[PDB]
């Protein structure tokens, strides 16, 4: 296998020989250079958006990958015209990533059957279901074409979006400081530390973002994260 | 209303960082009528009961002992299964560690009722009237259904007459469940392992609580396997359903359903094994602080760090 070692270790973790399993993913996977600008941005996003109520662990970035799923950029192209495009987190159990990478994020969690994202890394990290003896997880960064957001302060099961709306935003009490947003390849990255959103009567601590069309998502990065738990299990 | 000075009230309430309901003070004055020298012991010969806890401060027993020298009322007469909501005021039979305490859903609120527990038997808390007059009356009435000794019976009926008249003059119900308790029980979201109920705010959108994904019976089975595991490796495996539920508590917290983590941590505390102290020491402090019940976060952290089965009198 001429694949870089971090890529080989990622393949081993997600799952034939390595290069044959790699092909099953139908995804191009490259290592982001630790000294690149993408890496700086991504590590700042991780550092700044760990929420204060997620205090069981600290997160350590092991590897950062740039990913491109076959056909996905073409599938996403009509949505690139839409306004409000944002780079957001999505965590999942390691056992789902074979299918995630081959098939993309799919639709079957309190705003109905949708594809869920967060702007706080630790919020998404919890959906890895990592364990004290199982302390490595995978988390995605995806470009999400949010457009006109249906803003909500509590759970609603959405059969369909209200006309004119393209996505749902659950309003958090705490939000990355909008003054610290930066633009990366035409995508807004909300990597500032959390401040009060000013949203007065919302029942969510942190933002949630949901889209109801699988084509509204362009996966861009995959991170391998170490969960450093703060206390022993017993 | 009771003839206890502002200064003595502040002495009790500032040490515990909790207000006491007025029946606490009235009952002290009743017990002084019973025995002016040693009111704390006025019920000992007849009922086997002694007033303790905040009553020790009214009694002046804390004199010559201070915070600097190791005085912590968060642990004083805190029996092994007393959750932060439960503040011991009366002790009975040492064989079962029978005791009664005020039960508060919130440190900012007066007690909902007087609960009892036998800490050598189990973690169960039983409501026993909404004030201490009722709690001692109910106990006395029960003792009268258990005995035939004529001398003891005549003693108890005299005390019963005095207690009943005092409570009637003051307006304290002697019923096991009062209107106050019934209204509070309509806000209970889950019984928990101790059966006394858990109350958290639930808003018009049903935000505030969600259930655990396991029944109580199955959670007890999970706890049993963790306790009976024979090695570190086995125990980590048996812990897997707990870690899963702790993950779900995180989601519930993110959506302001703080009661779920309170319930999980409480059941683990109630089970009693030291193997749960680190997980309950994460779950409960965070839930209490999210619920703005900070004193209970302080109690649970101090109690888990020193959860004694038999040396709990801070004044001994
Ligand atoms: N899978 C996720 O990261 C997620 C994000 C936000 C809400 C729910 C789930």
Numbering used by the authors:
A (entry chain B): 663 to 677, 788 to 880, 889 to 1014
B (entry chain A): 30 to 345
Task: Show passages lifted from the paper.
On the designated hetero-dimer interface, Phe268, Phe280, Asp283, Cys285, and Lys307 of HPF1 were found to directly interact with PARP1 residues (top-right and bottom-right insets), and these residues are conserved in HPF1 orthologs from different species. When binding to PARP1, this negatively charged region of HPF1 merges with the active site of PARP1 and changes its surface potential, creating an overall negatively charged joint active site that could potentially enable access to the positively charged histones. The benzamide molecule in our structure clearly overlaps with the benzamide moiety of BAD (an NAD+ analog mimicking the ADP-ribosyl donor in the reaction). The HPF1/PARP1-CAT ΔHD complex structure also suggests that HPF1 not only restricts hyper-automodification of PARP1, but may switch the modification from poly-ADP-ribosylation to mono-ADP-ribosylation. Compared to the HPF1/PARP1-CAT ΔHD complex structure reported here, we noted that the ADP (i.e. the acceptor for the next ADP-ribose in poly-ADP-ribosylation) binding site is partly occupied by HPF1 residues Asp283 and Glu284, implying that HPF1 binding is likely to abolish poly(ADP-ribose) chain elongation and branching. However, in the human HPF1/PARP1-CAT ΔHD (reported here) and HPF1/PARP2-CAT ΔHD (reported by Suskiewicz et al.) complex structures, HPF1 Arg239 was found to only interact with Glu284 and Asp286, but not with any residue from PARP1/2.
When DNA damage occurs, PARP1 can sense and attach to DNA chain breaks in milliseconds, which in turn activates its ADP-ribosyl transferase activity for modification of itself or other factors, including histones. A previously uncharacterized protein, C4orf27, was demonstrated to be a cofactor of PARP1. The hetero-dimer binding interface was confirmed through extensive mutagenesis, combined with ITC and ADP-ribosylation assays. It has been well established that HPF1 binding to PARP1 restricts hyper-automodification of PARP123,26. Remarkably, our functional analysis of the structure shows that HPF1 and PARP1 form a composite active site, with HPF1 contributing key active-site residues.
